[PDB]
Ligand binder design. Sequence first.
Ligand code: GTP
Ligand code: GTP
Ligand code: MG
Ligand code: MG
Lengths: 150, 8, 418, 180, 180
Amino acid sequence: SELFPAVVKNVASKNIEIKKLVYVYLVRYAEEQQDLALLSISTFQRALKDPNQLIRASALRVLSSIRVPIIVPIMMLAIKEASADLSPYVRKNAAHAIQKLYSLDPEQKEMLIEVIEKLLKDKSTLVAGSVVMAFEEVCPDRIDLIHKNY
Amino acid sequence: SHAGYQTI
Amino acid sequence: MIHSLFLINCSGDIFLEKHWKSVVSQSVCDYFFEAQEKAADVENVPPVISTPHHYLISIYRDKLFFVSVIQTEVPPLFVIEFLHRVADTFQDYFGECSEAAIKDNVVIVYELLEEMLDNGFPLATESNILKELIKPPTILRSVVNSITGSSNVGDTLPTGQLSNIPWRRAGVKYTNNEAYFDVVEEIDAIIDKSGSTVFAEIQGVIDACIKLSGMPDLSLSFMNPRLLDDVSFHPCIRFKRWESERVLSFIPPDGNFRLISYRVSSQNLVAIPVYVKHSISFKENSSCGRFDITIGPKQNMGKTIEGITVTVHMPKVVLNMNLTPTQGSYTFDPVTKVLTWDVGKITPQKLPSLKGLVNLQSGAPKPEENPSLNIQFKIQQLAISGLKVNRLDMYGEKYKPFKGVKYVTKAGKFQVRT
Amino acid sequence: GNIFANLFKGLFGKKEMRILMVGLDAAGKTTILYKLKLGEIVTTIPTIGFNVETVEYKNISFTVWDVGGLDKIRPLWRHYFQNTQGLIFVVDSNDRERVNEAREELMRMLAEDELRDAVLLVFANKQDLPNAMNAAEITDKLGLHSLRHRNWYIQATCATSGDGLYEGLDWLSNQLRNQK
Amino acid sequence: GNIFANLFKGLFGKKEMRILMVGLDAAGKTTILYKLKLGEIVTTIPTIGFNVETVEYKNISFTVWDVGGLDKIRPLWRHYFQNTQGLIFVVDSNDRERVNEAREELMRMLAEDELRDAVLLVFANKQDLPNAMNAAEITDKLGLHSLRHRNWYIQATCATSGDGLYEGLDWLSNQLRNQK
Ligand SMILES: Nc1nc2c(ncn2[C@@H]2O[C@H](COP(=O)(O)OP(=O)(O)OP(=O)(O)O)[C@@H](O)[C@H]2O)c(=O)[nH]1
Ligand SMILES: Nc1nc2c(ncn2[C@@H]2O[C@H](COP(=O)(O)OP(=O)(O)OP(=O)(O)O)[C@@H](O)[C@H]2O)c(=O)[nH]1
Ligand SMILES: [Mg+2]
Ligand SMILES: [Mg+2]
């Protein structure tokens, strides 16, 4: 934990394996150094717009993962934007990010229910399972929602 | 490597 | 679901620490240590252990304990299979899962665990997709990376992930177009003191090593399908066609792969290959006794039995044991009272056997029974189930790959009462 | 023979696959080109002439020309038609008002004898818009299924997120870099 | 001695001259960095963390960090102060309302012992604005003439036209790449 400021500076390096390793470090130690961990959020924001969708998925994973209570609004915006990414892999990672957000902020439950209701209508075979997982995790009692999708 | 295998 | 994973040796030391949701105190492993202490062996560890504020679900395999942590309600089968799969993938990328194999390659295994499990949820589970997201640690790849700055981490999502066949990467080519199939059968059996058949069965499984290029559609069919029942099927097969046409038409993925598994119906008698003559004496409070075992082939279908090993867990009364083997190797560890004899091969000219005297404990009463007899054996070019393939057609490609099949029968859980 | 220059080029990717990008005003063509070349969003004014950038992807050196869609230069596309291999045609996902003109001009461009040998790829940009048309309805209005003897395909895309741009490049790579 | 690696680097320019860019919100720092790296104008949202790009100019590999000016991250600049050589400080040409806060924060940054050895260059971005202040009045409000023992200079600039950006790089090159 003493080495957080030195590592965080490289969070935008163009060397990809260095990217993955620094992502690991931030995921590990974010919850201690709240103020220091704020620094990577802009790089994540930019990565969310990259034409490569796999990079988008990685950025979504990390941006969800950071448990700094300040970044609640930008994360909320991030899931809402990823909601219709038209890239199904990003969609599955979005479902996981929804579960992440609910784990971090209980008070967003109504919005999370709305976005999950949006997700269930997806015809993509590789997102349905994760979306159902999200439903079980966040709102187990919403038997109303799935009725059309049975 | 192909040795030991019955033809099919 | 899964919060974090602790990789702990049978020693009692904690080697690989991982976390996915929140930092779980390492103190939680103390409960595992205590539960291990109460049990009589490492093998006796529960798979579900309850602590005041965490649940531990464990796997035991290859002298390494994999304890995970859970805080919500999750189906036990889910966790147990995910852990067994991380073990399997460790085997695939490093030959095997050992504390040496882990500690020697810390960075790659941490990257792997990060890729596979996301917030305790399954992200990447199929072998081939994981092969392309992160490369195997090939030494030539390592020197190439050092030379050119190339990376072990990919940058493009493999097309198979978004394909209608998520189990195999697309666009794979090999100059040596070939494919191998392996049908391995195990003889589960219990044999009484009288040599009668207590309960026996055949457990059969098809393995397939595929080195085809392109997008082949392989077809596997059998001469005697009626012998197949309760057959298992990987996602790669089209269940509807098997139900209708009784044909294994499928698209195999790359690399090593277990194709289908099956059992043989109890309607047909299981052909037991090996019989035994056996005799041990235990005089009460005597310092010595006699041991006599003779391994014999009963139904070999005209095929040789090889790779034979006999292990016996002697009771506490035994101190030492004076025997001479007719072949193979005689080994006895007095600390664990384990009687291990390497038999090897059986020659019809002379049946291998093991006989001699047992150095017992003086003043120790005779044990109430003789420990049962377990025996390992392998038969090559023979499937006791009598299953046979019919044909191997291919569609979608133009080449004619090398085609071959094997039939190897390896002993199942074969135990002989005495 | 001493062809080592071509082998050296093929060791890294010699495919060029010249592409001409055409469309109507405000379709997003220029933003597509510049995000492919750079990645971000760049403040831009209407383009009245043409641009060029070279992008490398999957060992293919794609070169895309951004000829403007303004009517004041519209007939000028004829001069760029020769020697092209790919024809990018962007359709605004919510230009129901000018969709018929788009289809008419697209059919006219397909009518060029020089462009007879090209492959047509329709990018449905502005996918983010709520009142945006889906792929199916865009195809229905364009009648790209009515086309014959022309390899074709359509792909939904959102430029501000870059959604599917790599995918369109992948499609061209499969077809532009086909068996020959 | 075998120092051929350094000679090879100097045959093309090894100077690095790390630069930290700091300023207040909406000063235009981020646009400056990205136009230097690319050349165009890129649509951008407020930056809440930090960015990095490497730009080469006159055989000098300048590296500029864009740490955000938002108050929610303002004190965090301390962590980047070490090992820097250049301090870019952008001033909005018409931020007469927040100019005093800008000067206070600039003086505070000059008060860092780590930054004692740096060279300060004040970019007066937004030069295009009509109601924009000239260089002289900006200096008068900033009191950069009151500074002592600190090499300094100010340069008017307009990012949307890129006016003087090369010139600021030239000034840094003269001073950052000084006699030693
Ligand atoms: N909402 C939305 N706007 C977009 C999208 N793509 C481009 N735009 C906007 O559409 C407008 C026109 O984009 P341009 O790229 O200049 O259009 P063009 O096809 O180059 O126009 P011409 O130069 O006249 O041929 C700009 O304001 C873009 O930011 C998109 O996917 N969604
Ligand atoms: N008129 C005018 N606007 C400019 C100029 N330079 C930048 N801007 C605009 O000023 C606004 C803010 O620019 P940014 O580059 O995002 O400002 P910043 O300093 O990076 O802000 P933070 O990220 O919050 O630190 C944007 O709308 C820019 O287009 C300029 O020279 N003239
Ligand atoms: Mg344009
Ligand atoms: Mg900024």
